């Protein structure tokens, strides 16, 4: 995260870390949406342009973490990926359209004051909170500009108008995505950097005080606007996979 700050312990109990086994290091971010389901970007696991193809065994998930590296007894829990589900229509060759993936755990994880699932949107919530101007929140252990944050970072940023999203790049932004971030003339900066991909983009609903995941970090603006996966746009798919298992 760029221009963010150290998050408060348990400020995002749904944050999930995708830790690689060798080299042992952080791969991406993710969120906990249930006791057995983890949500992340598709390119965090499979991205041919970079010869990237991670199998379930190539890693695991560290849940309820705060520090970026230090192991955290009686705080973080580690799970084993049972199955990975990349979106069928996920295309990387053009613009990461439908850059989303589901990861099921071999064993359900218990919740705590540090580990707690986030709610997925719905047309009402989405249609009402997904509006340019409104600020969402992003978190992660991605780089900063040393460039390695000690603990999870946090930053809030505005949704940018689809029209503006378009002009800001030659990439054909689809409806399954939306861009967020500040305009150069805003002064204040802040965005998702490399390593924060697969991370949750959330909003606190005023109509019920609960936090909702509107997007997934697909293409951080820098370290221009960041591109995120439209979670509701793909909710249908999510369930289809859930009901399936």
């Amino acid at each position: 995260i760029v221009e963010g700050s150290d998050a408060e312990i348990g400020m995002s109990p749904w944050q999930v870390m995708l830790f690689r086994k060798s080299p042992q290091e952080l791969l991406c971010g993710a969120s906990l949406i249930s006791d057995r389901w983890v949500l992340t970007a598709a390119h965090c696991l499979l991205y041919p342009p970079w010869d990237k193809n991670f199998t379930e065994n190539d890693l695991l998930v560290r849940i309820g973490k705060h520090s970026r590296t230090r192991y955290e007894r009686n705080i973080e829990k580690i799970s084993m990926l049972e199955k990975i589900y990349i979106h069928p229509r996920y295309n990387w060759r053009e613009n990461l359209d439908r850059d989303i993936a589901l990861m099921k755990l071999k064993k359900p994880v218990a919740f705590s004051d540090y580990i707690h699932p986030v709610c997925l949107p719905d047309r009402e919530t989405a249609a009402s909170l997904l509006q340019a101007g409104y600020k969402g929140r992003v978190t992660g252990w991605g780089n900063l500009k040393k460039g390695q944050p000690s603990v999870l970072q946090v930053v809030n940023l505005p949704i940018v108008e689809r029209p503006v999203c378009k002009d800001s790049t030659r990439i054909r932004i689809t409806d399954n995505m939306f861009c967020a971030g500040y305009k150069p003339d805003e002064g204040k900066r802040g965005d998702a950097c490399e390593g924060d991909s697969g991370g949750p983009f959330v909003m606190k609903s005023p109509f019920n005080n609960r936090w909702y995941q509107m997007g997934i970090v697909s293409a951080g603006a820098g370290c221009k606007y960041g591109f995120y996966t439209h979670v509701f746009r793909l909710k249908k798919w999510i369930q289809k996979v859930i009901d399936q298992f």
């Binding site: 348990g10 949406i33 707690h116 409104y134």
Partner: peptide, 30 residues
């Protein structure tokens, strides 16, 4: 899942995280 979105150390104790208000203000405008 039925208690999702509410933070054990924040909402559940009537506490506001360091900068969530900013988000609230966004809905308003400033």
């Amino acid at each position: 899942e039925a208690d999702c979105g509410l933070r054990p150390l924040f909402e559940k104790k009537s506490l506001e995280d360091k900068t969530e208000r900013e988000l609230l203000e966004s809905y308003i405008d400033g």
